[PDB]
Amino acid sequence: FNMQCQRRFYEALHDPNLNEEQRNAKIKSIRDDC
């Protein structure tokens, strides 16, 4: 598997500066483009 995307995902998952909408948006970009 790709560790970079995994790191990016866990970062977005636990970022306190992101709300539900922003968290899901970031995760979606990781899931699709990473």
């Binding site: 560790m3 995994q6 899901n24 995760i27």
Partner: protein
């Protein structure tokens, strides 16, 4: 449940934790009579109806019936955050629709401790040796364990189910079977553990003749 029976299966632990995977909730309906075939599925995420489902009908089972399954892709974060997933099953040979609900186990998550153990001296007599991966202190029991050597996956392993410990946490042991020669040659065997309480939902502990 009731014959036709409805079973709701949670996503695979690995799938909800790894962004490279696609976690899904599976809605299986067994014992659906030969006479009455068609079945309708209605998926609900915390009340709200969703339509991204891959609805499936009849697939014959021995006792003159059919297996009616349904796949609904879920967001990793949505499962791990505690969202409830509902499946409404409709059938003509059924008096009222069946509603099953599944969600991630509630409680404070605890970080798993991964330990690798070489084979016992008493086992160095057999042509095949056992490598152990002790995984303790984790919460909830949702976890995935894999073995690998030189980047390539090692699949001749058997993992115990999570066992409830006295402190409320879960533990397990994954046993990998390897040839005595391979262990004694210096080969490095790694154990990969995936859990929500772990950083990046992933850790890897290595073991070799050292």
């Amino acid at each position: 449940l009731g014959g036709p029976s409805v079973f709701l299966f949670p996503p695979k632990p690995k799938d909800t934790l790894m962004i490279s995977r696609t976690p899904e909730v599976t809605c299986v309906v067994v014992d659906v009579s030969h006479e009455d075939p068609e079945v309708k599925f209605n998926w609900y995420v915390d009340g709200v109806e969703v339509h991204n489902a891959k609805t499936k009908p009849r697939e014959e089972q021995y006792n003159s019936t059919y297996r009616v399954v349904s796949v609904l892709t879920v967001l990793h974060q949505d499962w791990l955050n505690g969202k409830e997933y509902k499946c409404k099953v409709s059938n003509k040979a059924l008096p009222a629709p069946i509603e099953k609900t599944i969600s991630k186990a509630k409680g404070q998550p605890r970080e798993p401790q991964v330990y690798t153990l070489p084979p016992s001296r008493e086992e160095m007599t057999k042509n095949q040796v056992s490598l152990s991966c002790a995984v303790k202190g984790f919460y909830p029991s949702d976890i995935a364990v894999e073995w690998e050597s030189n980047g390539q996956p090692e699949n001749n392993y058997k993992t115990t189910p999570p066992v409830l410990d006295s402190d409320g946490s879960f533990f397990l042991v994954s046993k990998l079977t390897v040839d005595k020669s391979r262990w004694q040659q210096g080969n490095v065997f790694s154990c990969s553990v995936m859990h929500e309480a772990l950083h990046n939902h992933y850790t890897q502990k290595s073991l070799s003749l050292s």
